[PDB]
Every structure is written in structure tokens, then in C-alpha cells.
Amino acid sequence: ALLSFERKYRVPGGTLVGGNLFDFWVGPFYVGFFGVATFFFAALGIILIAWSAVLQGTWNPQLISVYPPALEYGLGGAPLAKGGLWQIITICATGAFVSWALREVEICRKLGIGYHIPFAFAFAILAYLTLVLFRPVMMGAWGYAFPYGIWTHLDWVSNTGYTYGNFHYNPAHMIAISFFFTNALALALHGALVLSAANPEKGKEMRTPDHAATFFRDLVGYSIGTLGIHRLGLLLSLSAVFFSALCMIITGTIWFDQWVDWWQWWVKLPWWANIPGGING
């Protein structure tokens, strides 16, 4: 049930809501008021999923699909079988997510640590809310949202993308990807650096963080340090997701033509627009 050093940390307090009521653990897990909230929202949203699956007439996860209301229902409420179920589920999902974040906050307090984790998580939540709430509302209907289905959500992504030609041309999407690739680069390096210092050549002593620093200064002539690469990581990852949200929120709202055509602006700047040759002349 406890790690050899856990007990001295399992002290009362830190709860946001409800005092000592739910201030306790279940095995390794911390409950807290929001422990309950998320359990409640999760049980519910799952039963509502099992329920859509019968209306669909399939017990196969590769087939189960919970679709949003159709483009005719606008931003009104749809019947259960015709999109209502997906709305309740979204409410439930969002409820689960937020609750899961606030529990993280409650654990943070009990342990006397920083709130950087619930904070970073909120970016993920904002991305999801962008795709099923912010965008559709701004667009004008709940069916612009993606379905809750393993493969169908992929269908939605492919179809939404192609609605604007090659989505690669979305400028914000370019920068968002750049961050995803860079973050993965930095994660591989960071992990590799620490391990190589902690696990040297055979028989040699554990390297020092001064070695790790040197190694990198030698390689590319600069070392960000141990508080630095951790600040870096948090940032790249949060940024990736921030730009992801932006590329979507603008797509279909303030730009609805082909993304590739938006680049005409650069090219149709008066100083070099009518000048011959090249590719665009």
C-alpha cells in the first residue's frame, strides 16, 4: 500500500473543497472531493457510451462510434440517437478532465509543491475544448466537432483537413509541428544526456553534471543547464499544443478557402509581384 518513505507525507489537509470529508486514499490513489467528481463524470460517460453502442448495434471498439449532431441542428440540442448522446458525453468528458486537474491541484498542496503540472495539463484540456466547443460554436454547429470513435475520429481529421486542400499549408499548423518535432528532439537528448552521465563506460565512476555540461558544450558549443532543459521541455510541449489550438480555431472561421492560396499574400507584395521568372513568374 505505501512506499518505504510515503507515510510521513500522508498528512491531513490541502483540500480545496469539503475539508476532511474525502481527504483519504484508496490503495496508492488519492481521492479528495474531485476524486469523486471525476469518478462520477467517468462512470456516467462510459455508461452513455455503452448505451450509444446498442443504438448503433455493435459491441466492437473498432466500430463504436459516438457521433455529434448534424449540421441542421446548429447549436441547439439533438435527440439521444441523433447527437444528444454525444453532447452529454462531451459535458461528461470536460467534467472529468477539469475535475482531474483540480485533484492534481489538491495533491500539489498536500505535498507542498508547485502547480506546474495542473497548469500544463490545462493546455491539453484547452485543445480538446477548442475542437468540440470553441470552434463549433464559432462556426455555428456541434457537427463540426469530431466523433468519439477510434477510426472515425481519424476520418474526421482527414476529411476536415482536405476540406482546405493540403492542410500542411496552414501557417499555424507549420509552427505547431515544428514544436512537436523539436520537443521530441529535446526529450531524446535530455533523457540520453542524464542516463549517459549516470551510466558511464564500464568500471568508470557516475559522471557529474559538469561532464554532462561539457559533453554538450563540446558537441554544439552550448549547454542550457539542468533548470534550463526542464524549462525548455515544459515550454516546447505547451507551445506545440498552443499553436495546434490556434491553427484549428482560425480554420473555418476567419479562413475558409484553400490554405495554399493564403501564401499569395507574400508573393503579391508590390515590390517583387510583377517581376519575371522564377516559379511565380
Partner: protein
Amino acid sequence: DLASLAIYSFWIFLAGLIYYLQTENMREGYPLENEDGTPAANQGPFPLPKPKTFILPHGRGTLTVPGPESEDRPIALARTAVSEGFPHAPTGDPMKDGVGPASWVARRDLPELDGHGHNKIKPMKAAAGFHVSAGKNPIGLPVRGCDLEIAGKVVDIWVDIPEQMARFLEVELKDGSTRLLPMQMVKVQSNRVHVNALSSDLFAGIPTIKSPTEVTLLEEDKICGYVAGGLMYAAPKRKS
């Protein structure tokens, strides 16, 4: 076909890999224990990994994990229920006792050393050639506690030499004794340094270091521990 082969292969690789990764993350805090310190009956689907040994620099010895784990200090906590899974209430002063968010670990009563074998962290007066290069210089500023009362004055910066990082502010209290304050728990303002975690009357409680040019892993832990604990335990003395 080949593709089918490859993907089935991969899902197998991945499983042993998630297995490898899981056991390697058990080199500490296991075996699991009941709240009374006796080994728990259920330790999970996963065995303990075979020990590994760390050869630590500056002839400071070896570390073999997993290995015999021991708190190596009395824990001033008492059960609050008759069944497992409930909080344990401090039996004294949590801050002074070092339990809850104010907890510390019985690390080494030796300072962390740089790649060369010199003390990693040094007070700036003894760190030849170091100076504040950017931002507001803290040294000389009054230190204010959450109760909005002055507790002392900043009389130096404890700097990390290999990283050239400000780790702690050395503070001078009303009686002339100093304490170390972690650099992550203080807000450097233009006309003062503000400490949200501790009220003025608790600064004296900040554990002291046995030598004025060193800090040990043990003292860092007791100090960082104590100050963080203030967030929950100083609460009744923190204002808006």
C-alpha cells in the same frame, strides 16, 4: 505477410520494454509497506530488478539499489482512523518535526561537489570573481514574511559555481544569526524580498548550517523542506 509479421513483433517488443521500464522504476521505495512498516502482502505483478551498483565520484563510495531502505529518523505521526488509507496527524509541530509538506530526507551531511571535487555551492563572498550580472541585486534588501513584517536583510547570495546559478539568499535576522532561503521560494522585488511561505516569527525556526561557507545535502533538505511546509502550516499567519 511481412508487415503482419513486423507489427505483431513490435507489440511484443513493446511489452517487454514496458516491463523493463516498470521494474527499473522499482529500484526504490519497494518493497511496499503497510502503514506500520511491515512488508505489504501484495507487491504487484512485478518482481524486484537485480541490483545495480553505482560507483559515485570523489571516492564517496557506491550505491546499490534496490537495497535496504530506512527512514533513519523518528516520524511524529499518529493514525487518525482504524483502517488503512487515512491521513496521519502530526503529534507535535509539523514544521519542527519535519513531517507533511515540511518533510526532509536524511541525505548526506556532506556538500555536493563540482566535477573537480570543490563544494558545488558557495556564498558569493568566497566565490572569486562572481557578481550579479543582470536583474535586481537582492543583497541589502529587507526580507518580508507573509504577515507583511520584516524578518531581516539579505547579506549575500549563495551561488552554484558550475551553473552560475543563484540557489539561496543568505538572510540576517534581528539577533545577527543568518539563515538560508531557497531562491525558488522568494520574490525579488525593487525595494524588498518577499517570502510568501513563512511569516516573520518562523524564520528563526529555519534550520541552521554547522559551517558559514558550506551547506550539506542534509541541510539543504531540512531548509527547503521547512520553508515549503510554511505554505500549509504558516497559513493562519499569512495575509492578503
